[PDB]
Amino acid sequence: GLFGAIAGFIEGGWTGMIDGWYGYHHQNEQGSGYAADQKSTQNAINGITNKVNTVIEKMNIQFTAVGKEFNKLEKRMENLNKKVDDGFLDIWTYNAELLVLLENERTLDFHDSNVKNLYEKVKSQLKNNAKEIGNGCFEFYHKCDNECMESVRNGTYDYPKYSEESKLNRE
Amino acid sequence: GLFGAIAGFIEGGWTGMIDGWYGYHHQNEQGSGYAADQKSTQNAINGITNKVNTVIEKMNIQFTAVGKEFNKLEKRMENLNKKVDDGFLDIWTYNAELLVLLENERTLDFHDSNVKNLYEKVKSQLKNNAKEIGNGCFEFYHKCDNECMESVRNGTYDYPKYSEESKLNRE
Amino acid sequence: GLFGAIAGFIEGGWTGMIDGWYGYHHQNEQGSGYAADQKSTQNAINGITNKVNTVIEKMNIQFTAVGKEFNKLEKRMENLNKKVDDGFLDIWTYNAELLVLLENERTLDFHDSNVKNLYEKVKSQLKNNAKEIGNGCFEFYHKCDNECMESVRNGTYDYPKYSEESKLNRE
Amino acid sequence: DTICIGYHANNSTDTVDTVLEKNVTVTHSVNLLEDSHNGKLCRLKGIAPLQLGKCNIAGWLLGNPECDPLLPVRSWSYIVETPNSENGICYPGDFIDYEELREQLSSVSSFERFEIFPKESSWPNHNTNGVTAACSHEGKSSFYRNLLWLTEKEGSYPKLKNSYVNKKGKEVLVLWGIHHPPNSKEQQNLYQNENAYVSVVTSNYNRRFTPEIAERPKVRDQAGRMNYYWTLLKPGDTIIFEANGNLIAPMYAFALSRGFGSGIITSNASMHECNTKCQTPLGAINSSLPYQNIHPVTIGECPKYVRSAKLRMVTGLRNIP
Amino acid sequence: DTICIGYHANNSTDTVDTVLEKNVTVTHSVNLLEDSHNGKLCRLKGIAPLQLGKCNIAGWLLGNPECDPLLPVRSWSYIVETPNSENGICYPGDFIDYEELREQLSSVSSFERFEIFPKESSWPNHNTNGVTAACSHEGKSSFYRNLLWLTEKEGSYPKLKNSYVNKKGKEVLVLWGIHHPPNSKEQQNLYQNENAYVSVVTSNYNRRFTPEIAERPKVRDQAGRMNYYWTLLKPGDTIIFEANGNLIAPMYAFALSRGFGSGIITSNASMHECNTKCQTPLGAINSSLPYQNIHPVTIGECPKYVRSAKLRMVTGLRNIP
Amino acid sequence: DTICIGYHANNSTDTVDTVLEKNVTVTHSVNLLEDSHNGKLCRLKGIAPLQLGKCNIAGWLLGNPECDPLLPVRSWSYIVETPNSENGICYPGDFIDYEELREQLSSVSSFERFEIFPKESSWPNHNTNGVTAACSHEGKSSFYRNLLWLTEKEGSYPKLKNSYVNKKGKEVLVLWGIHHPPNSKEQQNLYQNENAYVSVVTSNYNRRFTPEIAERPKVRDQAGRMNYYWTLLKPGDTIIFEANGNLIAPMYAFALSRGFGSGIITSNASMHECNTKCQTPLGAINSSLPYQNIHPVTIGECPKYVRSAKLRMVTGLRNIP
Ligand SMILES: *[C@@H]1O[C@H](CO)[C@@H](O[C@@H]2O[C@H](CO)[C@@H](O[C@@H]3O[C@H](CO)[C@@H](O)[C@H](O)[C@@H]3O)[C@H](O)[C@H]2NC(C)=O)[C@H](O)[C@H]1NC(C)=O
Ligand SMILES: *[C@@H]1O[C@H](CO)[C@@H](O[C@@H]2O[C@H](CO)[C@@H](O[C@@H]3O[C@H](CO)[C@@H](O)[C@H](O)[C@@H]3O)[C@H](O)[C@H]2NC(C)=O)[C@H](O)[C@H]1NC(C)=O
Ligand SMILES: *[C@@H]1O[C@H](CO)[C@@H](O[C@@H]2O[C@H](CO)[C@@H](O[C@@H]3O[C@H](CO)[C@@H](O)[C@H](O)[C@@H]3O)[C@H](O)[C@H]2NC(C)=O)[C@H](O)[C@H]1NC(C)=O
Ligand SMILES: CN(C)[C@H]1CCN([S@@](=O)(F)=Nc2ccc(C(=O)N3CCO[C@@H](c4ccccc4)C3)c(Cl)c2)C1
Ligand SMILES: CN(C)[C@H]1CCN([S@@](=O)(F)=Nc2ccc(C(=O)N3CCO[C@@H](c4ccccc4)C3)c(Cl)c2)C1
Ligand SMILES: CN(C)[C@H]1CCN([S@@](=O)(F)=Nc2ccc(C(=O)N3CCO[C@@H](c4ccccc4)C3)c(Cl)c2)C1
Ligand SMILES: *[C@@H]1O[C@H](CO)[C@@H](O)[C@H](O)[C@H]1NC(C)=O
Ligand SMILES: *[C@@H]1O[C@H](CO)[C@@H](O)[C@H](O)[C@H]1NC(C)=O
Ligand SMILES: *[C@@H]1O[C@H](CO)[C@@H](O)[C@H](O)[C@H]1NC(C)=O
């Protein structure tokens, strides 16, 4: 994708995370589990629901539209009516297919951006207290319990609390 | 936004910076102040002015366009004239509203990108001579006077000049 | 650009790299040379070829479309035929010019993204075994022969293999 | 201890297309194209259509005797013609401005069939019993139910003169015909005058008709012709018929009510006890989707017709399990 | 010591919409939709319009006496009709190809009203003083200013024959009428011949008119009818009128100049001493914006009409003070 | 030791436009707008066009003698008229529904010119040798090749009656004319009857024509007029002509075949030994591009016409050597 996260440095998705589009997987002495980031998922849902509604609202309802009849001496008028009907159908088919293609590309890039931004938020919090092991995973240089993991997930990670221990194990 | 700077890791804007769209705030022993980045602001202004002019230029001027009259035995032709007028109005209203919505989304993402790129330019210059304290701010590990601040703003920061002092205070 | 690589922190392009859109230049004791990244270039080629084909496929072939004749007592019908022909021409000219402008902007941003993602892939591999010297170049803290360079290019760089030597020269 | 950043995946096999890539499998998606219909003719917004059965518009308005007679008053939301309407005009000729009349009926929501000139009161000095084998009924010669073939009585065709004042408060559609015999011997036999004429006048209509006699190729075994004419009589206006021959006089007229959103369609589907907001000649559509690919002809509040086979917008992510 | 990266904010309350989000407050924005007009009829590119006042197109061209007479020569940029034009055709009948004539006038920029057949020189053997109560003026019976009702003189209606050669170098619009009395007694009284005819011929026009006599409903208290006809006489061409009755002869014709960008509109606004590049029936528009939502009918160089209520493009950033 | 990330550059000077920036030099690009044609009239999908030469549609169908006679049977893909077609109708008058006939011919792919009424077999009691100076040939008076001017023979004009049955299996286009002398002396001289009439009838066509005699301005030195009429005779149907004067009888008719994708264009280009899938009045287009800016009139499989001067999509990168 444009932001390099989905199908990029994060190779695959998580079937085990069913509660959201983006989230975290943790592993410490207390166990393991998946936790969706509710803030980013809900914000994305609102944006995407906005996009689909905008596409539907932009297309007015088609009210009654039937054909006309012409006698054998009105061929020019009949062909003009056909040219109008065919021309409008050409444009609306064109507009509809292109709008979906264009918005589909942006939607996938939008999801790619959210994953990258979420990744950078964690990386900017941990700093040198952890190391990038690839695949979007961080290995802590200190013990990180469930309360410590929750602090990373909600953006309140206490970096000074673990700096001394991390530096020792970072050696 | 798509690039995570505006309303992201930089929470809010600066009412005190009136001379540009993007810029710097500094704090040292000589005082504090706001300084807009003229290069990025002027480049963005040229791009945005380009976009608005392109939208206006793409819409040709509407020359004279009035209605027609039909007698009681020309109802089919009257309804064909109405179908043409309504159909064109449907398409142009559709094109106009969607173009604004699409370009508005890109314009906000364009500004988000400029802030992020400006942030990364400073970060790539300071390297380990300063530390990321969040909210888009850097705290220097050395004394940085007005001349030193100007070097960061115009891309000529002398990293080796302060490496020894920064390493000492970085301890 | 939107991602800041092309015409950004990588100032200019390489006329000496003729085998691809993105690639690497290396310099060690065994010599120097340009090597295109075949994976990213081929993927971009497939995407761009997709985009051009989609634009052409979305425009149906124009089958026979000639004018009509009207006598001196059919001026209203003649002007209706002109209004239909002019109106459709206005829309298709509008759609064609805007589609090219919009896709051209996205195409340049697409190439900018590929360079940035390629740069970040190398940076995430080398970590602290090398230093960012600007202009998109990395200076190794250890000897890196042709086999070592090939490992970076294909994503199999052995970071632990050189950590001790890099740390010594990093001093 | 480790923490990882990741994204959702599932068992979805939905695919979408983008400008850069096709057949992208995605976790969630929304279909925007309606392609399903029920295959039935339904009531539209609570009002049933007017089905003409074996008749087309021309046959119903003139009163072709081979179609089942309708109730005196009908109200509808759209008009259905069968694709093989064999019963139309039965005596050959020209229906003047027929297509314009069809366009007028496309905005009519109700009719009342009433006797404008009563059969046994309006023409005391003329014969009104004329029938033809072209408009047969049950194997016997007959004629249009709404018209009357006036001919000579006791060897004479007096100059007739009759009028009607529109006191219905709605437009009244009046139809009549002009007969053109194939030779002068028949013209004298039926109408007793060779230089005959028909005059029809209202406040805004003024036309004079004259027979044009010549031998013609047989159409439905008739060398004669009948030309059919109509006009809309405004509320409060008078129509006057004057003729000394060849007039196919009106007997029943239609008081018409104007409505919105109606139209005429051709369909072989059957009427069912169902209600819809959108009707096509193939069937009814129950959908809130913005597009459909079922039929370009629509009545009611309908999705926009497009030629596309698939219109799917991705809502979720690329699916990589 | 610290340095920070930031972006602009201000007190702006302007909002824009995006595909992903609505009611986004932004620092700077540009309105693209013109919604203001001055509510007046103005000169268009330095040329004043032709206001018909109480007349419609039909009344002005025929010369209805209830409208103020115009100057012999006028040049305009557009034509204004009032929504309640009571003065049009005053003697009831049909204006043949009236809508086509209106379309022709939409590309006319000037007229010269000149005497094609002088009143006291062209018809020495016919009475030209005919007037009717339908075309009244100041409570007295009158007639069209551009036409002449020819009737019998001294009990005789000689077969007239008059012609005009177009030496104006521009198209000449000629109008005439045909009278249809309601009974043969009046036809003989006015024109002395029962089988009368009117012939009008040019190099490209060739039509013959014959009266059609019948009793008709009273329209403006007249059971008779007058049918109005017109043709465009090409430069250098001749028109010949031949009749032995029922001709409403032309007296004044119009030499027409062709222009570009003109049209006919209906408006109740008043003319003002102003100049504009864009005129709508509601008022004039002074704007460089690409869109407007004021009126779909426009004359001049105008923004494109759309149904939208708001079209605002953001130029600045999201505003977060 | 160093490793660097970079991108391609070359000597390309191609420029593209974006919404944010114009005159962007790019490494690779694709032109989408076809602006080249060969300037010749070519065969379309292997079929040569029908070139009318000095004739227009009217002159060819009536058989103006100043044009080179065509082969009895022709099949074509499109019809070419020259911009200065001087040879059309040579005897002045009106070609009724001429534009409708042109529209019919736009979907015709073949004709067979055959004798519907043989010259020396169909009119034994009438003179068929009438010629006029208006339709001259080699400096001598002549007449249309497909029509016959019937006049009196031995001081008498018997009431003629002739018919043709369509046994061609295709529609037959029949053309005829009606002559209007400028005075009654000539009407009696040519046709011996003053109250003459012409009748033409088929199963779906029924019209009666009557001369209208008056002095008219000279057009091509003729004060008389000839009105031209046509009808399409359905397969298996009969057409009957009945007249006692003024009939310009048909002699040759056209059996027509229906096709797809054809049309009529005006062009001064010359026919060449070439083949194309797309033909414009300026020349043929050989291209797979989606757009063209050569001409809005196209025949065949053609790119879409747009007003743009440049439509270039970038495929490569911004070029910064
Ligand atoms: C369009 O996108 C779909 C979504 O993935 C593609 O469908 C998948 O295509 C593969 C290959 O044709 C199908 O078969 C698989 O092939 C391997 C090779 O032998 C076989 O061992 C597997 O067991 C499997 O059958 C796969 O079932 C199919 N998945 C579906 C239909 O859900 C498709 O190929 C794309 N392209 C087109 C042109 O449709
Ligand atoms: C559309 O966008 C505008 C731009 O912000 C929104 O306008 C603002 O809406 C709030 C809430 O309705 C207004 O009232 C505020 O509410 C708090 C709660 O009590 C009150 O204490 C504040 O003093 C303030 O009055 C606010 O004034 C208003 N700002 C404006 C109009 O400039 C608006 O809500 C958005 N939505 C819609 C549907 O318009
Ligand atoms: C459109 O984009 C093209 C692509 O670069 C621009 O073309 C280049 O423009 C420059 C300046 O007009 C040309 O001249 C150069 O100027 C310097 C100044 O003296 C001179 O020393 C150089 O030797 C050189 O001649 C340059 O040749 C030209 N390159 C081309 C045509 O390939 C162009 O300016 C842009 N703008 C417009 C309005 O076309
Ligand atoms: C006329 N109809 C068809 C229209 C009218 C407008 N809507 S609507 O805009 F709401 N459509 C959709 C349809 C689907 C979605 C979507 O992907 N999910 C819904 C929210 O949980 C998401 C989720 C589920 C599991 C795990 C993680 C995330 C999945 C969205 Cl976001 C919007 C439909
Ligand atoms: C037909 N009319 C309406 C059209 C014709 C084309 N133009 S135009 O394209 F120039 N429009 C605009 C309108 C506004 C802007 C804009 O945001 N600022 C102007 C430049 O200083 C910016 C600034 C101000 C203070 C601090 C920081 C930055 C604000 C721009 Cl960039 C373009 C208008
Ligand atoms: C109707 N015609 C005109 C259409 C039908 C569809 N195609 S097509 O989509 F294939 N067009 C193009 C045209 C050009 C390109 C392109 O930039 N390069 C081709 C691949 O090597 C690229 C390269 C070369 C040297 C060094 C590095 C990279 C250059 C592409 Cl990617 C697609 C044309
Ligand atoms: C974040 O999680 C921590 C648990 O470590 C908790 O103490 C804190 O209150 C949470 N903050 C928010 C804003 O939820
Ligand atoms: C950048 O600022 C420094 C001040 O520290 C100054 O010496 C230098 O000349 C400036 N460079 C540019 C290109 O403006
Ligand atoms: C990558 O390059 C190295 C050379 O250092 C080679 O040993 C390895 O097999 C390569 N891997 C792939 C997947 O090409």
Question: How far apart, in whole angstroms, are the C-alpha atoms of residue F177 and residue F189?
Answer: 19
Ligand at minimal distance from the CA of D14 is 1
Q: Which CATH architecture has domain F1-36+287-321?
A: Ribbon (2.10)
Resolution for the entry shown, Å: 2.0
**How does strand D33-34 pair with strand D291-292?**
parallel
In angstroms, the CA D63 to CA D16 distance is 56
Determine the longest span between alpha carbons in chain B, in angstroms.
97
Q: How far is F97 from chain A (nearest CA, A)?
A: 8
- D118 burial (CB, 10 Å; 0-12 / 13-18 / 19+) is exposed
D15-36+287-314 and D42-266 have identical folds? no
* Interface residue ranges in chain A relative to chain E, Cβ cutoff 8 Å: 47-48, 50-51, 54, 103, 106, 110
- Which residue from F17, F23, F318 has its CB within 8 A of the most atoms of ligand 3, so it is best to mutate? F23
- For B46, C153, D94, F26, F27, the CA distances from F9, given in Å and listed in that order, are 25, 20, 75, 9, 6
What are E146's two structure tokens? Answer: 């551009």
Q: Confirm or reject: Cβ of A151 under 6 Å from ligand 7.
A: yes
Q: How far is CA A122 from the centre of its chain?
A: 18
- Cα-Cα-Cα-Cα torsion A130, A136, A137, A141, nearest 10 degrees, comes to -10
Domain extent at residue A88 = 23-170
Q: How close does chain C come to F75, measured CA to CA in Å?
A: 18
Are the beta carbons of E4 and B89 separated by less than 8 Å? no
Q: How far apart are CA C51 and CA C102, in angstroms?
A: 12
Residue of F270, F286, F268, F266 lying closest to F278 (CA atoms): F286
Mutation test of ligand 1: which of D12, D14, D23 has the most ligand atoms closer than 8 Å to its C-beta? D23
State the Cα–Cα distance between residues F200 and F223, nearest whole angstrom.
Answer: 26
CB contact under 8 A, B72 and D232: yes
Chain A interface, best mutation among F100, F230, F297, by max A CB count within 10 A: F100
Give yes or no for D205 touching E (CB within 8 A).
Answer: no
* C-alpha span between F53 and F91 (Å, rounded): 20
Side-chain half-sphere exposure of E277, counting CA atoms within 13 A: 10
CATH number at residue B84: 3.90.20.10
Residue partners of E195: CB distance under 8 A and separation at least 6: none
Q: Which residues of D touch F240 (CB under 8 A)?
A: 214-217
CB spacing of A81 vs B80 below 8 angstroms: yes
* 3-class SS of residue E147: strand
Residue of chain D whose alpha carbon sits nearest to that of B80? D103
Q: Is D313 in the pocket of ligand 4 (CB under 6 A)?
A: no
In-domain check, residue C150: no
Q: Six-digit token pair at E214?
A: 């019948």
CB of F119 sitting under 6 A from ligand 6: no
Q: Could you tell me which chain F residue has the CA closest to the CA of D218?
A: F203
Q: Which ligand ends up closest to the CA of A49?
A: 4
Judged by CB atoms closer than 8 Å, whether chains meet at F214 and E238 is answered as: no
Whose tokens are 């589009």? That residue is A21
Alpha carbon distance C74, A9 (integer Å): 68
Residues of D in contact with F202 (CB under 8 A): 217
- Is residue B9 included in any domain, yes or no? no
Separation of alpha carbons E137 and F108, rounded Å: 60
> What is the DSSP secondary structure assignment for residue E11, as one 8-state letter?
S
Say if strands F252-258 and F171-180 run parallel, antiparallel, or are unpaired: antiparallel
DSSP A61: -
Q: Which long-range contacts (C-beta less than 8 Å, at least 24 apart) are formed by A154-163?
A: A155/A121, A155/A125, A157/A125, A157/A126, A159/A125, A159/A126, A159/A127, A159/A129, A162/A129, A163/A129
Position C166 in a domain: no
Is E97 in CB contact (< 8 Å) with chain C?
yes
- CATH dotted code for D42-266: 3.90.209.20
Environment class of E236 (CB within 10 Å of its CB; exposed 0-12, middle 13-18, buried 19+): exposed
User: Vertex F309, ends F306 and F310: CA angle to 5°?
Assistant: 100
Which residues of chain A lie closer than 8 angstroms to E19, CB-CB?
50-51, 54, 103, 106
**How far apart are the C-alpha atoms of D272 and D265, rounded to whole Å?**
17
How many domains would you assign to chain A?
1
Q: Return d(Cα E163, Cα E174) in angstroms, integer.
A: 12
Q: Please indicate whether residue A45, judged by its CB atom, sits closer than 6 Å to ligand 4.
A: yes
Picking from C67, B155, E104, B144, the residue whose alpha carbon sits closest to that of residue F264 is: C67
Domain layout of chain E by residue ranges: 15-36+287-314, 43-266
Tokens of D259: 């409505």
- What one-character DSSP code corresponds to residue C127? G
Question: In whole angstroms, what is the distance from residue C28 CA to residue C150 CA?
Answer: 12
**A18 found inside a domain:** no
CA angle D187, D188, D190 (to 5 degrees): 70
Neighbours of chain E (3+ CB pairs under 8 A): A, B, C, D, F
Residue B142 lies in a domain: no
Rounded to the nearest angstrom, the minimum Cα separation between A113 and chain D is 11
C-alpha–C-alpha distance, residues D28 and A68, integer Å:
42
Task: Tell me if E23 CB under 6 Å of ligand 2.
Answer: yes
Chain C neighbors of E232, CB-CB under 8 A? 72
Beta carbons of D172 and D250 less than 8 angstroms apart: no
Distance CA F267, CA F278 (A): 15
Question: What tokens appear for F105 in the block?
Answer: 């011919």
CA dist E224 → D202, E132, E211 (Å):
12, 11, 11
Tell me which DSSP letter residue B73 carries.
Answer: T
Cβ-proximal residues to C163 (8 Å cutoff; 6+ apart), any chain: C129
| Distance from C-alpha of E304 to C-alpha of E296, rounded to nearest angstrom | 8
The DSSP-derived string for A97-112 is HHHHHHHHHHHHHHHH
Cβ–Cβ below 8 Å for B113 and C2: yes
- The reply to whether ligand 7 has any atom less than 6 angstroms from the CB of A147 is yes
- Asked whether residue C165 is assigned to any structural domain, the reply reads no
**Architecture label for domain D15-36+287-314:** Ribbon (2.10)
Ligand 4 pocket: which of A18, A41, A48 to mutate (most atoms <8 Å of CB)? A48
Residues from chain E contacting residue A106 (CB–CB below 8 Å): 19
Q: What's the DSSP call for residue A65?
A: B
State the pairing for strand pair F252-258/F225-233.
unpaired
Residues D50 and D82 sit within 8 Å (Cβ to Cβ)? no
Nearest CA in chain C to B77: C77
**Regarding the domain delimited by E43-266, which CATH topology (the fold level of the hierarchy) does it fall under?**
Hemagglutinin (Ha1 Chain); Chain: A; domain 1 (3.90.209)
Pick the residue of F20, F307, F308 with the most B CBs within 10 A to test the interface with B by mutation: F20
Using a CB-CB distance cutoff of 8 angstroms, which residues of chain A are in contact with residue C99? Answer: 98
In sign, the C-alpha dihedral spanning C103, C107, C110, C112 is negative
Minimal Cα–Cα distance from A153 to chain C, Å?
Answer: 23
Q: What are phi and psi of C90, to 5 degrees?
A: -60, -45
F12 contacts: CB under 8 Å, gap ≥ 6: F25, F26, F27, F28, F29, F316, F319
A150 lines ligand 7 (CB under 6 A): yes
Is residue E8 within 8 A of residue E42, CB to CB? The reply is no
Of chain E residues 18-37, which have a CB less than 8 A from chain A?
19-22
Contact yes or no for C26/F4 (Cβ under 8 A): yes
Sign of the CA dihedral with E187 first, then E193, E194, and E196 last: negative
Nearest CA to ligand 1 atom 33: D23
Exp. method: X-ray
* CA-based nearest residue to D41, from D303, D265, D259, D261: D265
Between chains, do D215 and F201 touch, taking CB under 8 Å as contact?
A: yes
Distance from the Cα of D36 to chain E's closest Cα (Å) equals 29
* CA-based nearest residue to C84, from D174, E21, F57, B77: B77
Q: What is the CATH number of domain F44-266?
A: 3.90.209.20
Give dist(CA E199, CA F182) in Å, integer: 12
Q: Hey, which of F10, F11, F12, F15 would you mutate to test ligand 3's pocket, going by the most ligand atoms within 8 Å of its Cβ?
A: F15
Contact residues on chain C for F228, CB-CB shorter than 8 A:
none
What's the DSSP call for residue F71? P
